[PDB]
Design a protein around this motif. Structure first.
Motif, PDB file in Angstrom:
ATOM      1  N   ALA A  80      15.271 -39.592 -35.653  1.00  0.00           N
ATOM      2  CA  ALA A  80      14.672 -40.888 -35.332  1.00  0.00           C
ATOM      3  C   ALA A  80      13.172 -40.802 -35.097  1.00  0.00           C
ATOM      4  N   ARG A  82      10.222 -43.054 -32.921  1.00  0.00           N
ATOM      5  CA  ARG A  82       9.779 -44.179 -32.117  1.00  0.00           C
ATOM      6  C   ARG A  82       8.304 -44.424 -32.382  1.00  0.00           C
ATOM      7  N   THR A 119      15.872 -42.831 -38.374  1.00  0.00           N
ATOM      8  CA  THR A 119      16.119 -44.130 -37.737  1.00  0.00           C
ATOM      9  C   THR A 119      14.877 -44.674 -37.018  1.00  0.00           C
ATOM     10  N   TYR A 121      12.977 -46.681 -34.302  1.00  0.00           N
ATOM     11  CA  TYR A 121      13.064 -47.256 -32.960  1.00  0.00           C
ATOM     12  C   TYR A 121      11.705 -47.897 -32.732  1.00  0.00           C
ATOM     13  N   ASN A 123       8.818 -50.226 -30.909  1.00  0.00           N
ATOM     14  CA  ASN A 123       8.167 -50.970 -29.835  1.00  0.00           C
ATOM     15  C   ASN A 123       7.362 -52.140 -30.377  1.00  0.00           C
ATOM     16  N   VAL A 164      15.683 -52.888 -38.999  1.00  0.00           N
ATOM     17  CA  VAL A 164      15.482 -52.306 -37.672  1.00  0.00           C
ATOM     18  C   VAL A 164      16.579 -52.784 -36.728  1.00  0.00           C
ATOM     19  N   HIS A 166      17.062 -50.967 -33.583  1.00  0.00           N
ATOM     20  CA  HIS A 166      16.728 -50.445 -32.268  1.00  0.00           C
ATOM     21  C   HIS A 166      15.319 -50.866 -31.893  1.00  0.00           C
ATOM     22  N   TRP A 167      15.220 -51.860 -31.018  1.00  0.00           N
ATOM     23  CA  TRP A 167      13.933 -52.409 -30.591  1.00  0.00           C
ATOM     24  C   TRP A 167      13.617 -52.048 -29.136  1.00  0.00           C
ATOM     25  N   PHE A 168      12.325 -52.052 -28.803  1.00  0.00           N
ATOM     26  CA  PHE A 168      11.845 -52.082 -27.425  1.00  0.00           C
ATOM     27  C   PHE A 168      10.792 -53.170 -27.368  1.00  0.00           C
ATOM     28  N   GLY A 307      14.697 -47.413 -21.735  1.00  0.00           N
ATOM     29  CA  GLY A 307      13.826 -46.329 -22.143  1.00  0.00           C
ATOM     30  C   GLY A 307      13.108 -45.787 -20.924  1.00  0.00           C
ATOM     31  N   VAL A 379      17.669 -44.003 -22.666  1.00  0.00           N
ATOM     32  CA  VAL A 379      17.064 -43.181 -23.711  1.00  0.00           C
ATOM     33  C   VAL A 379      15.793 -42.572 -23.121  1.00  0.00           C
ATOM     34  N   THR A 381      12.463 -41.831 -23.736  1.00  0.00           N
ATOM     35  CA  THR A 381      11.630 -42.382 -24.799  1.00  0.00           C
ATOM     36  C   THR A 381      10.284 -41.673 -24.944  1.00  0.00           C
TER      37      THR A 381
END
Ligand SMILES: OC[C@H]1O[C@@H](O[C@H]2[C@H](O)[C@@H](O)[C@H](O[C@H]3[C@H](O)[C@@H](O)[C@H](O[C@H]4[C@H](O)[C@@H](O)[C@H](O)O[C@@H]4CO)O[C@@H]3CO)O[C@@H]2CO)[C@H](O)[C@@H](O)[C@@H]1O
Ligand SMILES: OC[C@H]1O[C@@H](O[C@H]2[C@H](O)[C@@H](O)[C@H](O[C@H]3[C@H](O)[C@@H](O)[C@H](O[C@H]4[C@H](O)[C@@H](O)[C@H](O)O[C@@H]4CO)O[C@@H]3CO)O[C@@H]2CO)[C@H](O)[C@@H](O)[C@@H]1O
Ligand SMILES: [Zn+2]
Length: 472
Positions: A80, A82, A119, A121, A123, A164, A166-168, A307, A379, A381
């Motif tokens: 993944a 981020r 993957t 992730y 923000n 997408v 997996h969002w933050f 996170g 997670v 992060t």
């Protein structure tokens, strides 16, 4: 062994391993590709604000080299990545007109990530408020930020959410409140004594409240409009460093707990329990905004996972709780930082003065969240450490202290998970040496070295450590 018994077999099935960057810290093309300025652009371009008057105009130039960087992360066996979307790269003014070239970049990045089996992730926000919104609305001081951020979020969900999952929403809103509105050392440089204005006793709480309300509004939009079709998740990223009572006295233990509550409870108690920590209500009083019952119900349960950025730990010494004239968020805690116990420092420092290498802090934090907050999905992060400036290429590459850092911190994380903590993933800060805010390019957090003259990438020993540990 240099892996110290660690491998994917040592972590839960399907546990996610990745690396992390942020847009302003790695992308470059800060004033190109149609991007509008953020508050960090204006800040970094002001003489004296950043080490060496450096800025993120070019940074690592990931904007142009993203395929190289994605190939690298895949060759190191990560699952993944981020990264963040720059708001002002999508909406140069923060609202209104869409910058199609900006959208195309993130499409190209997301598609390439997926093509390579990495993957995304994502923000939505990492310190980089559009300058236009700061000037027009007063930024995070204005409750209207919930609407503005929601519209931005809505666009991103619509445009990228088929891919997408997996969002933050935000990255470390505590640091925004503390540095931007308490100490006034980060944009918008507000504090009681500050040229730009401000009030260190009130504004950090206003700002945190607006982050929570904005988060809640964005998630409500996701859930009501996009979730059924897209079936993804939205969390938030919070910093949490560990606090350990200096002694077993009532006041030292109380102090450590106050610090935990003012640090992580500030956001976790609303997100999990729908109210601010009792001690913050007791001490901050009318300077702490009140959620209405409706707002509290919107905020509670509004994060699909938590996170946590975890780096360090400190000792806390207690005192008699006093009636005080309010001065600042930091002074509200009524605690004393201590960095030695029984004549021994808590750990050695990395390059950043605040970052004490304390692997057991990782266990401390993860265990605490498990026990206090009903074991929510966590997670990690962001976790990592920095080398100083001015070393040779080869000195950067032989990052034996970082190798030891990751082995030890991950061993402590494994301990917490084995004891039943619901941790779903781990992300190393950072893939690359990058623009480290006030430190500019004088702080090197990457597992991959970046030559900031030529922009060449060179994997460090720690990168090869990850490759070996993560082989499938
Ligand atoms: O290779 C490219 C690049 O790598 C850089 O990093 C090196 C490290 O410098 C080097 O110390 C490291 O050596 C590892 C080796 O990869 C592991 O396979 C080995 O694991 C052993 C272990 O020690 C035993 O206890 C265990 O039971 O079994 C295994 C058997 O394999 O451990 C050593 C560490 O002692 O490898 C890295 C990657 O190659 C270099 O710095 C750089 O110069 C190279 O160009
Ligand atoms: O930095 C790497 C990477 O990590 C993520 O965020 C970092 C911030 O970059 C960093 O500024 C921030 O530093 C905190 C630190 O955690 C606290 O321990 C420290 O506490 C102070 C306290 O506020 C004072 O009242 C007291 O007197 O002293 C103590 C000890 O110094 O405050 C500093 C603020 O300078 O930590 C974050 C994580 O904890 C980001 O995600 C990423 O973008 C960064 O590049
Ligand atoms: Zn370029």
């Amino acid at each position: 062994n240099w892996l110290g018994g660690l491998s994917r077999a040592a972590f839960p099935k399907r546990f996610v391993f990745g690396t992390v960057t942020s847009a302003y810290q790695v992308e470059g093309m800060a004033a190109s590709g149609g991007r509008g300025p953020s508050i960090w652009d204006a800040f970094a371009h002001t003489p004296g604000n950043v080490a060496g008057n450096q800025n993120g105009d070019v940074a690592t130039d990931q904007y142009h080299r993203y395929k190289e960087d994605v190939n690298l992360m895949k060759s190191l066996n990560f699952d993944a990545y981020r990264f963040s979307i720059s708001w002002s790269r999508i909406f140069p003014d923060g609202e209104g007109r869409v910058n199609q070239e900006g959208v195309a970049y993130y499409n190209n990045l997301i598609n390439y990530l997926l093509q390579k089996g990495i993957t995304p992730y994502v923000n939505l926000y990492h310190y980089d408020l559009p300058l236009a919104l700061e000037k027009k609305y007063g930024g995070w001081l204005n409750a209207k930020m919930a609407d503005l951020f929601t519209e931005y979020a809505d666009f991103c969900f619509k445009t990228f959410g088929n891919r997408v999952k997996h969002w933050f929403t935000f990255n470390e809103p505590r640091i925004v409140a503390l540095l931007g509105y308490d100490q006034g050392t980060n944009p918008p440089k507000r504090c009681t004594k500050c040229a730009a204005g401000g009030n260190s006793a009130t504004e950090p709480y206003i700002v945190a409240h607006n982050f929570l309300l904005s988060h809640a509004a964005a998630v409500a939009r996701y859930r009501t409009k996009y979730q059924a079709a897209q079936q993804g998740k939205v969390g938030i990223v919070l910093d949490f460093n560990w606090y350990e009572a200096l002694s077993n006295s009532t006041e030292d233990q109380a102090a450590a707990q106050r610090a935990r509550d003012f640090h992580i409870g500030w956001y976790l108690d609303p997100l999990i329990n729908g109210h601010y920590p009792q001690i913050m209500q007791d001490l901050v009083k009318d300077r702490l905004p009140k959620f209405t019952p409706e707002q509290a119900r919107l905020v509670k349960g509004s994060a699909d996972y938590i996170g946590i950025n975890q780096y360090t730990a400190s000792y806390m010494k207690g005192q008699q709780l006093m009636q005080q004239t309010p001065t600042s968020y930091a002074a509200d805690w009524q605690v004393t930082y201590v960095f030695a116990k029984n004549g021994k420092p808590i750990g050695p420092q990395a390059n950043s003065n605040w970052l004490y290498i304390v692997p057991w802090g990782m266990y401390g934090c993860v265990n605490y969240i498990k026990q206090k907050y009903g074991n929510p999905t966590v997670v990690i992060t962001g976790n990592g450490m920095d080398q100083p400036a001015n070393l040779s290429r080869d000195q950067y590459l032989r990052d034996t202290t970082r190798v030891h850092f990751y082995r030890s911190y991950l061993t402590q994380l494994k301990k917490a998970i084995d004891e039943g903590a619901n941790v779903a993933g781990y992300f190393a800060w950072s893939l690359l040496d990058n623009f480290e805010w006030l430190s500019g390019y004088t702080s090197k957090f990457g597992i991959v070295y970046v030559d900031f003259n030529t922009l060449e990438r060179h994997p460090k020993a720690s990168a090869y450590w990850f490759r070996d540990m993560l082989k499938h």
